[PDB]
Amino acid sequence: APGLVVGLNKGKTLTKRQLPERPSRRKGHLSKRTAFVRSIVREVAGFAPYERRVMELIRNSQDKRARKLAKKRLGTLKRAKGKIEELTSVIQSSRL
Amino acid sequence: AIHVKGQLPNAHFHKDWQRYVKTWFNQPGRKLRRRQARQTKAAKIAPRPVEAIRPAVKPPTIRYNMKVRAGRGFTLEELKAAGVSRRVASTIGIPVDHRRRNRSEESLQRNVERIKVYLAHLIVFPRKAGQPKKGDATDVSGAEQTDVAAVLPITQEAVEEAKPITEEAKNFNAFSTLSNERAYARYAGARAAFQKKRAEEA
Amino acid sequence: PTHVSKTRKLRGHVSAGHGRIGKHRKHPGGRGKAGGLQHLRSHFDKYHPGYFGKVGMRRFHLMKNPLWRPTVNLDRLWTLLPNEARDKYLGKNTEVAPVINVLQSGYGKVLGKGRLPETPVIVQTRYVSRRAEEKIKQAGGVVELIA
RNA sequence: UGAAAGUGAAUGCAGGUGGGAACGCCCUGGCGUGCACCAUCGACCGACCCGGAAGUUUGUCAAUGGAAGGGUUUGAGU
RNA sequence: UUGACCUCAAAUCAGGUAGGACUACGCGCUGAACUUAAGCAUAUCAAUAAGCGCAGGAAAAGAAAAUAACCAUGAUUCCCUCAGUAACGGCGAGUGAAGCGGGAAAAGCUCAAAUUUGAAAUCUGGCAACAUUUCUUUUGUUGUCCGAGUUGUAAUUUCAAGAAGCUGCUUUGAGUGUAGACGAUCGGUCUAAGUUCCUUGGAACAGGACGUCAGAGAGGGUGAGAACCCCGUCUUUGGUCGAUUGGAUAUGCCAUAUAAAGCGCUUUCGAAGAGUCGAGUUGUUUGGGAAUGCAGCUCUAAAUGGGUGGUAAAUUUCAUCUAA
């Protein structure tokens, strides 16, 4: 397959290199300062009404309909699940 | 109407096209204008070459990857290997392409040698006449405006000449390998699904 | 030229070659291919069968670049070499066999039409048909697959 | 060539049969030879309908693969 | 009661600026119908004409929230090619791009997010000096007061990185005269040779002799076809004597490099744009097809996150880019 056009690892075999990391690909990494500021803003502002609804539903352990509510609010399951872990982490911290 | 031998007509001429017809009567006039501007630029920027040095890259497709063409500029990694500072390169006329990167030592060595030849054949005038500093020519009397194409062209890889036929080549089935590897790639996903499903069942 | 045209020979004849009964009117049958299922059906179904309807599956964002695979036959393989190479290798037994990279010549597959001389030769190619490679092997040559 | 994945054109002197241009030969015809063309019989390539031999690895029992052979059907083919 | 600050007014307040025209080309908005479909309603005409707003000598676009699936390419624009193609279409009439490839041209960067905190280091305006000029018309520097500014002006950084550190080499003016040379530039100026004879005619610029010039036998004029009568034409991309500019030079002077910067390795940290992305829906658009763009309304994230990989959805990987 290597050096064969067809196959699984198709293509010419060359002396591979280690590409230096791109600074533009570091984006999305949570900084210490960004994490600290967002914690302060969370503690000052609070939660959105739908975030309260999802939190209450998860507390009642109706997770499936909590996920459905989050998806209907945000718009995607990817974002809906991401909010689910965020609010799940919040409630566990509150109970502890 | 349609009653004659030949193709069915397809003339996209139902808009007001006569307003937007484009004629080419200025084709020699445009050609002469480009040359005069080209000659003006060469006289304005002399002695340095009219066209900057470009790297040698490979086009990105199975249809063209066997050819070597000219790129936009030398990558940061290539300049660092050649010993040219990123800031200095743009001053002495070495284009720098931040977007490109060297995935193979073959391409890196190709352009590194390309820069090294350019540096060896380069004459850099001192900023102040009479005091050469680091990279700087002591004698600049013989400077002339030449062409980078004459000094250093983009050369395609030479077609391999005759080589002996080995026994390991003799006992090699080209068509069977092609069909086997195509089927191997085609059912790679199904095999992995079978193996994982069997594993969880076990 | 207009001085060898037919409009120069109809000067004096009233209808100008278009008849007195039917006349030359603007569009007595429609404009273009209009009517190919109603009144041009005789022409369409006799001289252009297959014109109407759908066939096959529909492919989005087709790019011909990853499908590029021009083909060469076996009898054109030796023509792909320079004349000096041909004179050096055809008909003479040498320990080294020539290499014919068909990719450089601009082909993506070696097909099996034709015959080859009795001289071993290395064929470097992306693809090869089944009996094309069989003929090369039986002629003494080998096929080395490139990427 | 197929909608595609894909495969991809020599049993033979690149094939027989009939008519044929031109030439040769023989005593008006006869014999040889047959260009171009059409009638035609077959071979090859692809699609379709069968048929499952190697090989490949991965499930070997299987997975993948698709040679031989069979159609006298199909193509804007050799 | 005085004051401070915020907000909001007034003045023929000090100094400025906007309108209108032109609109071939350029950026938008808005927006048809005739017509084609042999009728016609989707379609087409056409993202056209008309209407409206806003620019420049070009405008726009532009340094990737870009392609691709390669041995990968590398801002934009235009040309050829892809290609009348993929696709879109009462799949009817008809419509219809993009990647690569070849070329013309090429040039890169600037902020917001950082404590200068051992010192708002920044800026407008008044006044007073000096200075400079396409220019007594232009453009500034210095000083000093009022003010703007800490609800943030400078330096520093922009993801291609960078910042903090660490040793160790290399590098440097936003200068101002002078002199001459070398170029460019619009412009005043200079330009070779028959009008010699005969015939015709109102007139010779015609015909016939005899000549001359030619780097000039383009063209015009002059009482008929004039290289030699005249303006010109060639020499000329030049001589000249006056001008304006360009980049070097040859020097003089002011330059406080205590500084500023490139490179080198860091067990390090590394701030990255929100009623925005995205989702649904409704219009409109596209070749974009279980939506290509745009807009309205509803819901509205995130932090290895978020875009895009041209068949909807869920999960998992892989590339790629870094939006508002």
From Swiss-Prot, chain A:
GO CC entries: cytosol; cytosolic large ribosomal subunit; preribosome
A molecular-function term among this protein's GO annotations: structural constituent of ribosome
Family, similarity comment: Belongs to the eukaryotic ribosomal protein eL36 family.
Domain of life where this protein originates: Eukaryota
Any GO BP: cytoplasmic translation
Keywords per UniProt: Cytoplasm, Ribonucleoprotein, Ribosomal protein
Additional note from the record: There are 2 genes for eL36 in S.pombe.
Subunit structure: Component of the large ribosomal subunit (LSU). Mature yeast ribosomes consist of a small (40S) and a large (60S) subunit. The 40S small subunit contains 1 molecule of ribosomal RNA (18S rRNA) and at least 33 different proteins. The large 60S subunit contains 3 rRNA molecules (25S, 5.8S and 5S rRNA) and at least 46 different proteins.
Pfam families from the UniProt entry: Ribosomal_L36e (PF01158)
Region (Disordered): 1-31
Location in or out of the cell: Cytoplasm
Name this protein carries in UniProt: Large ribosomal subunit protein eL36B
InterPro entries listed in its UniProt record: Ribosomal_eL36, Ribosomal_eL36_sf
Gene giving rise to this polypeptide: rpl3602
Function: Component of the ribosome, a large ribonucleoprotein complex responsible for the synthesis of proteins in the cell. The small ribosomal subunit (SSU) binds messenger RNAs (mRNAs) and translates the encoded message by selecting cognate aminoacyl-transfer RNA (tRNA) molecules. The large subunit (LSU) contains the ribosomal catalytic site termed the peptidyl transferase center (PTC), which catalyzes the formation of peptide bonds, thereby polymerizing the amino acids delivered by tRNAs into a polypeptide chain.
Curated annotation (Swiss-Prot), chain B:
Cellular localisation: Cytoplasm
Keywords of this entry: Cytoplasm, Phosphoprotein, Ribonucleoprotein, Ribosomal protein
A GO term from the CC aspect: cytosol
GO biological process: cytoplasmic translation
Statement: the UniProt record of this protein carries the keyword Phosphoprotein: yes
Protein's UniProt keywords contain S-adenosyl-L-methionine: no
Domain of life: Eukaryota
Sequence positions bearing Phosphoserine: 176, 179
Stored InterPro entries: Ribosomal_eL13, Ribosomal_eL13_CS
GO molecular function: RNA binding; structural constituent of ribosome
Location (main, coarse): cytoplasm
Function, in words: Component of the ribosome, a large ribonucleoprotein complex responsible for the synthesis of proteins in the cell. The small ribosomal subunit (SSU) binds messenger RNAs (mRNAs) and translates the encoded message by selecting cognate aminoacyl-transfer RNA (tRNA) molecules. The large subunit (LSU) contains the ribosomal catalytic site termed the peptidyl transferase center (PTC), which catalyzes the formation of peptide bonds, thereby polymerizing the amino acids delivered by tRNAs into a polypeptide chain.
Family: Belongs to the eukaryotic ribosomal protein eL13 family.
Subunit organization: Component of the large ribosomal subunit (LSU). Mature yeast ribosomes consist of a small (40S) and a large (60S) subunit. The 40S small subunit contains 1 molecule of ribosomal RNA (18S rRNA) and at least 33 different proteins. The large 60S subunit contains 3 rRNA molecules (25S, 5.8S and 5S rRNA) and at least 46 different proteins.
Protein's UniProt name: Large ribosomal subunit protein eL13
Organism: Schizosaccharomyces pombe (strain 972 / ATCC 24843)
Gene that produces this protein: rpl13
From Swiss-Prot, chain C:
Protein localization: Cytoplasm
Xref: Pfam families: Ribosomal_L27A
Residue ranges with Basic residues bias: 1-12, 20-30
Keywords: Cytoplasm, Ribonucleoprotein, Ribosomal protein
Span of the signal peptide: none
Subunit structure, as described in the record: Component of the large ribosomal subunit (LSU). Mature yeast ribosomes consist of a small (40S) and a large (60S) subunit. The 40S small subunit contains 1 molecule of ribosomal RNA (18S rRNA) and at least 33 different proteins. The large 60S subunit contains 3 rRNA molecules (25S, 5.8S and 5S rRNA) and at least 46 different proteins.
Miscellaneous field: There are 2 genes for uL15 in S.pombe.
Family: Belongs to the universal ribosomal protein uL15 family.
Protein name: Large ribosomal subunit protein uL15A
Organism this protein belongs to: Schizosaccharomyces pombe (strain 972 / ATCC 24843) (Fission yeast)
